[PDB]
Design a protein around this nucleic acid. Structure first.
Ligand SMILES: [Mg+2]
Ligand SMILES: [Mg+2]
Ligand SMILES: [Mg+2]
Ligand SMILES: [Mg+2]
Ligand SMILES: [Mg+2]
Ligand SMILES: [Mg+2]
Ligand SMILES: [Mg+2]
Ligand SMILES: [Mg+2]
Ligand SMILES: [Mg+2]
Ligand SMILES: [Mg+2]
Ligand SMILES: [Mg+2]
Ligand SMILES: [Mg+2]
Ligand SMILES: [Mg+2]
Ligand SMILES: [Mg+2]
Ligand SMILES: [Mg+2]
Ligand SMILES: [Mg+2]
Ligand SMILES: [Mg+2]
Ligand SMILES: [Mg+2]
Ligand SMILES: [Mg+2]
Ligand SMILES: [Mg+2]
Ligand SMILES: [Mg+2]
Ligand SMILES: [Mg+2]
Ligand SMILES: [Mg+2]
Lengths: 145, 155, 184
RNA sequence: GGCUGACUGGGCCCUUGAACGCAAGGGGCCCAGGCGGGAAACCGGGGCCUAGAGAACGCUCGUGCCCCCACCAGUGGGGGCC
RNA sequence: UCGUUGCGGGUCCGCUUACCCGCCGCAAGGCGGGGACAGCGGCAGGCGGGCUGUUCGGCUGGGGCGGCACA
RNA sequence: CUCGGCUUAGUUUUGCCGGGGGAACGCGCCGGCCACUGGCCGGCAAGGCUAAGCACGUCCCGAGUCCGAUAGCGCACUAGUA
RNA sequence: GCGGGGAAAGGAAACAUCUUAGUACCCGCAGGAAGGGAAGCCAACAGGGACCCCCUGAGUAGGGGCGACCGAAAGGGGGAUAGCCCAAACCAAAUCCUCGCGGGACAACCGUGGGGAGAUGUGGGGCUUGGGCCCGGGCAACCGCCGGCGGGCGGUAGCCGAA
């Protein structure tokens, strides 16, 4: 339902059009840590097809999107979908690192935390910090699920 | 003697109500259902099965029941199943150059209309008739010779 | 709805304006690359998968750039009746998509063209991506779709023997469960 | 002086075209409808007679409670016979 | 004329990144100029023996000119 | 859908190519000889494969109301040779 | 045989639309055949049921300086007969390839180790008698890979054959 021509109206310089806000390296590394912890202790999903279905089905808590997707239109729908379903999401710099944190042998363009077993406390803190970045960039808040 | 399905010839407006029967492509699923078979089982017994056909003819049902009893009592031997017995796919070379990809199939007209109505088919069909002088291509201008001769001889 | 359904939105009305912004930058690079280039991944992933693309060893995706418009019809230089003298508006019975597939095949000798799809247009050029498969690769040869291009042989002794056994077992089963009902 | 027959629907014959095939055009004699002139008879289907005359396809107009257009009905449109 | 043709401001101004032109560079890319023009493709009008196909009738005291003795 | 063009029996109605515009989604879409509306009927395009039954004659086999060294293939032979 | 480019002479008793002809010829690309082939079909309220080829429909409908001339399709009779898959829904690495070693009819495959592909999705599932999804019941399950061993027949030289 979100109209992409206003959502993606003003892209950031040096980033693909689907990147809406700039994420510092410290925040990205924390997200990768949470996804790794959630993998051993809770439930995660990885890959665009599985991440998209989790968001649609309402089972997502945190969505991680890599910034180096070579044809950008592979993942560009995900930020729009997360805003529609009010699921917090963050950008990570490398899909190769996102895949490794997801526990696979290939890169992942996207990954999603379904349940954070032991990372739930850290996940809440990460979502708050992401919310400050969105406010700085002018986007409304997305509460932690 | 394995029965052959009997179906009705489509009754055209031109016919004016006259109807006839013909041999069908296969027995319909409705006819097979009345004798307790599905498409797979009937095909394994050597019967021609037509899953497209909707009609159910009692004469077809009766022929099936009679022959099945003979088969299940050891009096008749079913022929080989009406399923593929060989698989023969050749390696393809130069599909793009011979117009066999989807783009070629579109330009040849095969997406929008039947093979028989495509322009390359018309070109080849008429070339053969003229080469063999078959049917109407034995005489060029046949229609006009007939037309003028009819006027003179029917005046 | 799969992610592939969402990926198609960039070639629909809802996403055209955002996609058309992106291509204005991308096409600058594509106008300076070679006319035929092998790419790691297809540009329209959802479209490529529908047409048979999979990221296996021996599957080649090539981007082809060619000049649009009508083909280069020549003005005849000898005697013709007036109907056969025109130039403007006369086109070829081949589409540019077939021309693109054929040019790609020349760059990859021995490979088979599976399919192709349109990617982008600019004022002078049209861009296609062509899917090619290597029929000599063991991964390709056993694929159920690619075997239709690369060839497939099943001995008649295998299928016929299997069918004869299935027919024999069916008749025995139908003797018990069907013969009374038929005669009843 | 009074009028519009330089009429509507048709048929037959003569000439063009000799005896002897063969356009268009022109002329003559009638039947029916409805008129004009005349007491009536009768005459009027242009000019006292012999010249002023044009196929197919296409278009256009007139005409009909008119015929047809693809499974059925309707609206617009198209086609058909004279 | 349609498309290429984009971005700001009130049909006009500006801009450059498209596109075009030149220089340097093996290439990467840099410099300068022009600039949404031009160029290019489609469509439309004009000029167009530059080029292609053809027609240039008949009768006739031979043909031609005349005449129409061509209806 | 529209414009140009080649083609087709395809005709206000065939297929396609090129220029420009350009959907919807199964509660949808497509077809039923001009367009649209209603009804009814039939279906599910824009991805891929598929034996058998059909064309041909360098070659092999058989046949002949065919020719018989100016004939019959150009060549019955150190002929596609000199 | 398949895709593309593509005339004129001649005919119309001139000639341009038209025909000749999508022919000659040119360019590209296959097979022992090619191409086609599994209903967004045809029909008309009655029903057919993938395709190609043969006979017919038929010189009919229709196209056409409505001229010359061009010209179907459905339907009917035959030859022959055969039906399936990719993508997607759902699951999410359960997958494929290659090499070494051991086993395994010299194979497929099994066990183990290394390398490559693979979340931008390998694989499972699914193909109008639509499917996915949930519940129950049943084996005649279903689907696929290898072509070893035994047997038979046929082809590629020949042998016997009356008086
Ligand atoms: Mg003919
Ligand atoms: Mg000529
Ligand atoms: Mg005369
Ligand atoms: Mg006479
Ligand atoms: Mg006269
Ligand atoms: Mg009809
Ligand atoms: Mg301009
Ligand atoms: Mg211009
Ligand atoms: Mg000249
Ligand atoms: Mg003249
Ligand atoms: Mg003369
Ligand atoms: Mg003169
Ligand atoms: Mg579909
Ligand atoms: Mg000789
Ligand atoms: Mg002799
Ligand atoms: Mg000739
Ligand atoms: Mg002539
Ligand atoms: Mg001449
Ligand atoms: Mg074949
Ligand atoms: Mg084939
Ligand atoms: Mg023709
Ligand atoms: Mg898969
Ligand atoms: Mg002997």
């Amino acid at each position: 339902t979100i109209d992409p021509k206003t959502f993606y109206a003003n892209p950031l310089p040096g980033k693909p059009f689907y990147v809406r806000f700039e994420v510092p390296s410290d925040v990205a590394e924390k997200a990768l840590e949470i996804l790794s912890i959630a993998r051993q202790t809770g439930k995660i999903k990885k890959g665009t097809n599985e991440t998209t279905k989790a968001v649609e089905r309402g089972l997502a808590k945190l969505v991680l999107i890599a910034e180096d997707v070579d044809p950008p239109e592979v993942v560009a729908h995900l930020p729009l979908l997360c805003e529609e379903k009010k699921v917090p999401y963050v950008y990570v710099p490398s899909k190769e690192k996102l895949g490794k944190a997801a526990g696979i042998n290939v890169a992942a363009a996207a990954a999603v935390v379904i349940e954070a077993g032991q990372a739930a406390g850290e996940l809440e803190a990460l979502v708050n910090k992401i919310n400050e970045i969105r406010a700085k960039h002018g986007l409304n808040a997305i509460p932690v699920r | 003697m394995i029965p052959k399905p009997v179906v009705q010839v489509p009754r055209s407006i031109k016919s004016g109500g006259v109807t006839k029967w013909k041999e069908g492509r296969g027995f319909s699923l409705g006819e097979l259902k009345e004798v307790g078979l599905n498409a797979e089982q009937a095909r394994l017994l050597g019967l021609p099965v037509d899953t497209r056909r909707d009609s159910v003819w009692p004469q077809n049902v009766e022929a099936l029941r009679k022959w099945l009893i003979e088969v299940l009592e050891g009096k008749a031997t079913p022929p080989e199943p009406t399923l593929p017995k060989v698989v023969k796919v050749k390696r393809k070379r130069g599909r793009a150059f011979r117009g066999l990809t989807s783009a070629g199939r579109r330009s040849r007209g095969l997406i929008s209309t039947r093979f028989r109505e495509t322009h390359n088919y018309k070109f080849k069909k008429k070339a053969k008739e003229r080469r063999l002088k078959k049917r109407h291509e034995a005489t060029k201008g046949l229609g006009n010779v007939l037309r003028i001769s009819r006027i003179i001889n029917e005046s | 709805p799969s992610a592939y359904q969402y990926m198609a939105m960039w070639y629909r009305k809802v996403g055209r304006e955002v996609h058309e912004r992106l291509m204005r930058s991308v096409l600058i690079k594509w106008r300076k690359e070679p006319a035929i280039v092998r790419v790691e991944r297809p540009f329209r992933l959802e479209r490529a998968r529908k047409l048979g693309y999979k990221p296996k060893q021996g599957v080649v995706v090539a981007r082809v750039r060619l000049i649009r418009g009508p083909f280069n019809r020549r003005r005849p230089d000898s005697g013709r009746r007036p109907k056969r003298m025109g130039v403007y508006g006369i086109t070829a019975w081949k589409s540019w998509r077939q021309v693109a597939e054929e040019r790609a095949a020349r760059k990859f000798p021995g490979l088979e063209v599976l399919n192709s799809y349109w990617v982008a247009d600019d004022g002078i050029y049209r861009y296609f991506e062509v899917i090619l498969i290597d029929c000599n690769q063991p991964t390709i040869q056993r694929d159920p779709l690619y075997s239709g291009i690369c060839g497939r042989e099943v001995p008649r002794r295998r299928l016929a023997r299997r069918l004869r056994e299935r027919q024999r077992k069916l008749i025995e089963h139908l003797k018990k469960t069907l013969l009374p009902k038929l005669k009843g």
